[PDB]
């Protein structure tokens, strides 16, 4: 009962901690840098074949193949250099809000309101695309699933939990708790050791995998959260909320650095991504278009308006030569 | 200009065909969306016809297959799982005629109906509206007029008056009455009356849609 007081004192102590380490005001550091310039992009390729909304996408480690998931009960694989279709996989639950392409290129994975991240094998004799596993254990709705190897996946569910698994068996090898609301995102690190999450409780969390326990908490928003990604150096990340704002957090100072807003924007973010050099942040809004930002000056440097509806998904590739956007108008795009 | 990248195109020229053939076949399996007050009538409204997270359903009628994605049992926010239902063909709404006194209930259902019939994703989305548990409403007013829950009402505390009053009080919350329509019915099946009403309403909505997919408005 009375223990609710030590909580407030410890909160004040943590505030003083992550405040005393603040004397920079990052925007006040780059006063002398030359800006990017101005960035126009051209829709090199366009990808059709979906008959309804698409809810996510993921590229491959070769920069050339990608994957999409839609509401027509379809998971399609694309060769983005020729707009050709390699595979079209039919689904069982058309309430889909996730997808993934494994690094090895062998497997993929989906997930939705069925509370199951079905996992598919692409390279099998018998010439077909069979479903290898169906992984249950949740009581919510999968909002993101991301691989680590060909035998270790990570899921995040709306029941305020996340989970690490093991395929050949099917049993949760780890569970991650500490949320007070719906989790709606995920992001793994380049060293595939410690991931990160961000939930509708206006809070994000920096976890660990081996151990199992949270490591840091992050606040600073005024509303829920809908997207998150890292910064190449596995030493920062970026959150996108429905309050029209996108923010950059660091992991060594435990605080936010820059806030990305503009009074003429009211709509809500859905997806976020970085660039191979971490010098340009992409953001997908609900105003039927997208945006672009510079991660060191806070000032826009371009726009990618070519969409007749919302922008639900987005993702840069490893090499760097391209970008992508998914939209509720059922047309994928490839800029560059 | 191409050697064996010409058989990687007789593949993407069959995959598309199969996608179409799988997309020109969802139409005849129309998609409804049941709703209801707190455990009011979502039980038998599903089993009107007798042929894992969110509930599916399937019942057939004159070469028309209805799928009723009951969603009144998913414990999350009213929003983050609702825009997954846009494009749906219609909506249903099952309310009780006499349970208003429990806890009132009529008020909650009215608040729900207002939150629904003016949602951002349900402007052009039509509605059906059933009124179940009627044979009992003939008694509740017989002894307890609805002025308990509508003191501003004064008239014959009887079926053919009070019931019509509630019907015309529910059929008039739509802030726009030209775009979308709103139907009405009662649950006296004869084992097959209501589902016929759904058939009629759904074919009418299909028409009102095609008559915009062909510019004929």
């Amino acid at each position, epitope marked *: 009962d009375q223990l609710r007081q030590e909580a407030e004192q410890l909160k004040n102590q943590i505030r003083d901690a992550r405040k005393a380490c603040a004397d920079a005001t990052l925007s006040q550091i780059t006063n002398n840098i030359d800006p990017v310039g101005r960035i126009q992009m051209r829709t090199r390729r366009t990808l059709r074949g979906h008959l309804a909304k698409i809810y996510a996408m993921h590229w491959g480690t070769d920069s050339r193949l990608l994957v999409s998931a839609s509401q027509d009960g379809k998971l399609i694989i694309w060769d983005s250099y020729t707009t050709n279709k*390699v595979h079209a996989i039919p689904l069982r639950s058309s309430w889909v809000m996730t997808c993934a392409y494994a690094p090895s290129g062998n497997y993929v994975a989906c997930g939705g309101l069925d509370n199951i991240c079905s996992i598919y094998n692409l390279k099998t004799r018998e010439g077909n695309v069979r479903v290898s596993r169906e992984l249950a254990g949740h009581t919510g709705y999968l909002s993101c699933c991301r691989f680590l190897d060909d035998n270790q996946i990570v899921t995040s569910s709306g029941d305020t939990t996340c989970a690490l698994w093991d395929i050949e068996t099917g049993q949760q090898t780890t569970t991650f708790t500490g949320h007070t609301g719906d989790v709606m995102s995920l992001s793994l690190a380049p060293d595939t050791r410690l991931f990160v999450s961000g939930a509708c409780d206006a809070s994000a969390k920096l976890w660990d995998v081996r151990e199992g326990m949270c490591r840091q908490t992050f606040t600073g928003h005024e509303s829920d959260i809908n997207a998150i990604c890292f910064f190449p150096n596995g030493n920062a990340f970026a959150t996108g909320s429905d309050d029209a704002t996108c923010r950059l957090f660091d992991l060594r100072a435990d605080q936010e650095l820059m806030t990305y807003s503009h009074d003429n924007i009211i709509c809500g973010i859905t997806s976020v991504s970085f660039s191979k050099s971490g010098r340009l942040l992409l953001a997908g809004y609900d105003d039927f278009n997208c945006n672009v930002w510079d991660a060191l000056k806070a000032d826009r440097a371009g726009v990618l308006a070519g969409h007749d509806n919302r922008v639900s998904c987005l993702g840069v590739t490893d090499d760097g030569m391209a970008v992508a956007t998914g939209s509720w108008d059922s047309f994928l795009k490839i800029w560059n | 200009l191409s*050697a*064996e990248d010409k*058989a990687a195109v007789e*593949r993407s020229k*069959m995959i598309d065909r199969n996608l179409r053939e799988d997309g020109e076949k969802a139409a005849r399996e129309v998609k409804l969306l049941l709703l209801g007050a707190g455990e009011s009538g979502k039980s038998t409204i599903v089993k009107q016809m007798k042929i894992t997270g969110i509930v599916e359903t399937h019942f057939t009628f004159k070469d028309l297959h209805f799928k009723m994605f009951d969603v009144g049992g998913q414990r999350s926010e009213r929003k983050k799982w609702i825009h997954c239902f846009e494009g749906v063909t219609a909506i249903i709404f099952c309310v009780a005629l006499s349970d208003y006194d429990l806890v009132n209930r009529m008020h909650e259902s009215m608040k729900l109906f207002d939150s629904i019939c003016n949602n951002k994703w349900f402007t052009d989305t039509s509605i059906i509206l059933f009124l179940n548990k009627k044979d009992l409403f003939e008694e509740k007013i017989k002894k307890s007029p609805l002025t308990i829950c509508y003191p501003e009402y004064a008239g014959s505390n009887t079926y053919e008056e009070a019931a019509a009053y509630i019907q015309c009080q529910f059929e008039d919350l739509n802030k726009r009455k030209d775009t979308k329509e709103i139907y009405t019915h009662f649950t006296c099946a004869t084992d097959t009356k209501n589902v016929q009403f759904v058939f009629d309403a759904v074919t009418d909505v299909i028409i009102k849609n095609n008559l915009k997919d062909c510019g004929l408005f």
Partner: single-chain antibody
Amino acid sequence: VQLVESGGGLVQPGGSRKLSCSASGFAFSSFGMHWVRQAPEKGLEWVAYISSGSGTIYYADTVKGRFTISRDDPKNTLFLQMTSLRSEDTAMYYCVRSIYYYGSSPFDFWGQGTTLTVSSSDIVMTQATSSVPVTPGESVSISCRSSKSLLHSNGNTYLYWFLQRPGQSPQLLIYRMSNLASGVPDRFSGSGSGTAFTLTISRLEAEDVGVYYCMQHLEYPLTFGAGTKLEL
């Protein structure tokens, strides 16, 4: 997997004959199919190609008119029909597989084939050697040379390396001059460019002795070497 062939036998010249393939264990409808041929003591010759959907058919300049390929996807069965036979058509025929898409592995399962006997501008690939003595532990490098550049401008190298042990049927080893199949070890490899192609083994061992072959899929028709035997 299985791919059986039937129909072979002994006919009189001028007659006609049918040959049937029966598959068991894969999505037939999603796979191209060929009919490679081999004579008693010579190399391999290509004869046809049907595709997925049946809307594509090729043939060899030697056979157009009298050989008719056909396919029945439901019952997973292929067909070849022969009219106006001769003695140059005495040979063993092999049912085969082929799937094409980015990341594929054509000629990844050969059948066992039937036998047919009777009474009495194309690229060329030069397979000179016809015998090489060896002893285990020996590391060898076989040669294949072409009459044109195989590399298409899209960055690839449309050459293939095969193998065939005695009393057996072939078994892919390499596809596209660099890439390695699934079901073989890291002992094999290959490399080169533009009419120069070298195979590479390390730590030889029995079950490798036979007749390696060569092939190109840059443009139809398809042409083979003539047999680089490898004995002890």
